[model samples]
Target chain A: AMTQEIEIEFKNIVTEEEFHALCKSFSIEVFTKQVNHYFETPNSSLKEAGSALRIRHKGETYTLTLKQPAEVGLLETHQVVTENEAKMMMETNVIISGAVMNQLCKLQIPVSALTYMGSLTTERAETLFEGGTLVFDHSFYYNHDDYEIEFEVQDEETGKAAFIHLLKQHNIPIRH
Target chain B: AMTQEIEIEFKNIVTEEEFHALCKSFSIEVFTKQVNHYFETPNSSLKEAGSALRIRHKGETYTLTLKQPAEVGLLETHQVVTENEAKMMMETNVIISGAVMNQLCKLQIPVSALTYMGSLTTERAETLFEGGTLVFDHSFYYNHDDYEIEFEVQDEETGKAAFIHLLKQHNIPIR
Candidate 1:
């Protein structure tokens, strides 16, 4: 499906300043009070380790993750998930939910909108390590259990590609 | 287009109590400081004849209007915009924006993930004089000067119908 191959670019390695500037450019005042950051390393059998940052803008919150292979390998890629990705998943879910929210909103239904469902890190791992560099893939699941809809959207394909692209672009060596 | 006939029941009018109940139901907090009230007269005429209120929820601000027809009888249908309608409009805009942002984020589009364009009200003299009750029709516009984009994006038809339905359901007399 044309939806599955839809791809986007992350042009630059998002620095703290760049991220802040991007948010400010959109007139979205970020509440630093609500920011959270975490990191995790998978076991030897695992293929990747991940670091994450969570931020809230207005009333909505989103997460971004940077992932790399688990072994004593070079930094390969970073997977990012923002509020926009989460909204995409939510809009897709609205279509699945039969509310026509997606149509009413005039959003293009992406191919991977309903493909995966799980924790953000787990989903990111699948996307990052599954295929080529920067394998960006995302999925949204409504938790009937939590009574609140939570999304684990990620860009695994793009993560690997982005990492490689960034290293190549900046002539940065992969730290083995 | 199936989009034309879709009817959304917004009668879950949130009174002070009902609004609180909604907050509890959604497990979301309402920010009291950011709320605003406004009045939208149909057609944007009789500038000062209407009333407005603004309110805030969870750090996000919303403007609610309560507009009525002008006293000169020139404008018809008490122009009315309300707190509930404003909130709904804001939610609709935020949700849509959120969806778009989510897509951009994943594509690593390097765009702002959230945008709050502030809300506004419109005068509906044409519809109100045509025998519609005082109901708030929250319309979204992009670049006020860009009429083409404004008209294209503003779901005026659905908005008007929703307002009229609300009035009829509440037994508010049209005209």
Candidate 2:
């Protein structure tokens, strides 16, 4: 079954030093592996529309998801893909037909023109905080290790307040 | 989910007149429309292996099935595909990644080499008889209409006996 949702979250790129500090303070020890293989059309139509497409590999399962700009945050359409399908798609840049492809068609993007851009592999950890989930990520891509923080929630008002307060309280500058 | 089975059946081509006669005598009144879009490699690798692949569009659902030769009958592997996937696959000659493709690869057929050969549309009707299912088909393809009959059962011996006896009893020359 495919899934749809409006993702409400706050994200920021952070310095490696601050990232470690926050991880230690939060007592975050467990981390999981994830790989996000990104795709785009030759004309970058999805990017032009402020959307992104990726197949995420996590825990021996692969999920194809499309994220588009929404009034709240971003609208996500997800479809589970088999290992065979994911391997071919990753190698050939040919997306299997599903909810994500259907969404791309609706956006006037040519599905056949999609090409593999790159992949980001991340070691991620999460903890509960202030009616939301706070996430820490150490991601590697293109010979670079990037650190990021994210807070996800159902309500935006209190979420923004909590997220911002956490950042300030940690003496970390917000990098959008 | 994917399904696999060995299909045991007997089939024969028949004339149009005999087809109608059998239908009337059997009281067959209901028929369903089905389109079978066939696919194969340019090298005819599947045909060489005595196998066939088709996407059967029946009712509102499309099923992708591959049939390979078995010791007793045919080994069938089936995967239910969405309309979107079927349309794109048929148009571009690209088979989706699934059990069928995996099986093809196991048979040493290159998935990227597969292409659409053509399609056969059939108006089908069926009935049960002699511990088996009897089917009548009026199929159309490439400006030609063909009629055929099939008898399917679990036990090949009884099925073969019943099917042959029915043909002989009707004075139908088993065409």
Candidate 3:
């Protein structure tokens, strides 16, 4: 089955120290490792089109998602595929022909032209805060570490303000 | 407030006679008349980009809609506006800078270059059929008449087959 939804989230990059501090303050444990396998055309057509294609592997579950620009936030269309399908997609350029593939075609981004760039593993932690979900991600790519914070909410405006306030309260610089 | 949705509808051109027959068959009275005021850039950029901008006026409500391509159907972003706002937009190319305008900008269609290309009034009727909505439209533009039938559904595959079957049952020579 295919699913579609508008995702309203506030994201900001933070230092690794700040990342851990927020986890400590929230009494949250940084658990669960998720891998994001990214893809793009040779000429980066999807990036130029302001879209991204990725297959997320969390535990035994794998999901293929296409993120497209929308009026408010990004329009995220998702599909669940088997582990073998995800592996094939990552190893080769063989994208499973489904809703995600059709979306790439609709955006004029050919599936045959897609190249599996690489994968990034993230240690993820999230907690409920201010009527929204606060997420801290410590990602590793090419042996380089990156930290980030995200606030997911149904109300865009209020969540944005709350995210900013949280960052300020934690003495974290907002690098968007 | 702004609203966004993916519109999955099947549209086919039909003769005026066929349009009336379907209305009569479904017992759908073409009671409401709606006006579609279309806009485009000087070079028809929006059209070339496979997108459309319009303000629909029906009864007391006016809506500004930006239709863009989607994976399954069309992504329709809508904003409700006042009658005065609608009149100002139709009279002049002064698009209110809001969600619809932002979408045009996101698509790289310059709102400043837009031209109000007049309006088309449509006599519309609809009924529930096959677990979906069936629509009949008779539209007039610059003294030109056009008729069409539309089937709106949440399920794309089933609705498409049902739409084709409905046309076949009517002997309406699917045009």
Candidate 4:
């Protein structure tokens, strides 16, 4: 059976200082090496679908992740890839040559309609909170650095209640 | 590339009337129309590495084909499909999904991996022999009765020789 992870994650923008504060407050483990996100639409065929054809990289390791419009938030399929797979995707090719493309075809989306859109890099920290994973991220690419607090909830009922307050409870700004 | 074709040529084989010299007439019934779609990871990765994935449809009927590694041509990954989504993949997902779930995943293979090549419909009658575009009810090479013509080849020198002299020899193109 395929593991369909229904990721109900919430994010809110914060300050660079707030990002660092969350790190100290949560005993976070950091990935000093940046995380990069890439996608390009030969057209926004994918983007228009409220989905992103993304590839994430850290150190030289690459993983292809496609997030589509799911019932709740989004359905993300993750595929760990090789160096050549990453380069083929980064180049002019539509990326049908990789693991992620396999999934795209399953969704009935043609790969030829996609190209490298752009890239976003991030400095991230991950920690296990009450009942889910909490992340402090400082992302950059093009012309900006965005600080955000993200909580990924597993069980929407109790885990969501925990996510709603934890941010504000920890003095971070948030909304219900 | 609204998506099209990869035509697989097949020669007519008969028990006694197989060759041109000992020719005989055969009836072709059931002029069913057929369209086949082709995909690959030669840079397409249909099922990953040295393989191809294809679709063949006749009206609402569709056949899914997969190709896997083999020295003698390649093993076939083929199946029957309908309008529904999930059932189309349950089995094929493992080869490309990157991880194997001990359970069947019961997941359907989505149509995203296929590049739109183009489409060709054959008024096919399960049957060929030809010389310079020869015809005896059926053009030795035309897959359909739609006057559809194609010259599929891997050779140029002598291949073109037969192509030129044959049809010219018969004057089918009105000399």
lDDT of each: 0.28, 0.82, 0.80, 0.51
Quote each prediction's TM-score: 0.18, 0.50, 0.49, 0.46
Judged by DockQ cut-offs, the docking class of candidate 4 is incorrect
Top-down TM-score ranking? 2, 3, 4, 1
Model 3 segments beyond 4 Å from truth? A1-176
By lDDT rank, best first, the candidates go 2, 3, 4, 1
DockQ of 1: 0.01
How high a TM-score does candidate 2 get?
0.50
Q: Number of backbone collisions per candidate, in order?
A: 52, 0, 0, 31
lDDT of 4: 0.51
C-alpha DockQ of every model: 0.01, 0.01, 0.01, 0.01
Candidate 4 per-residue C-alpha lDDT over A92-154 given as tens digits, one digit per residue, 9 for 90 to 100 = 655744456676787776677665534444667778888888877765422124678888876
Per-candidate iRMS values, in order, are: 19.5, 22.9, 26.0, 21.8
C-alpha positional error of residue B34 in candidate 1 after TM-score superposition, expressed in Å: 14
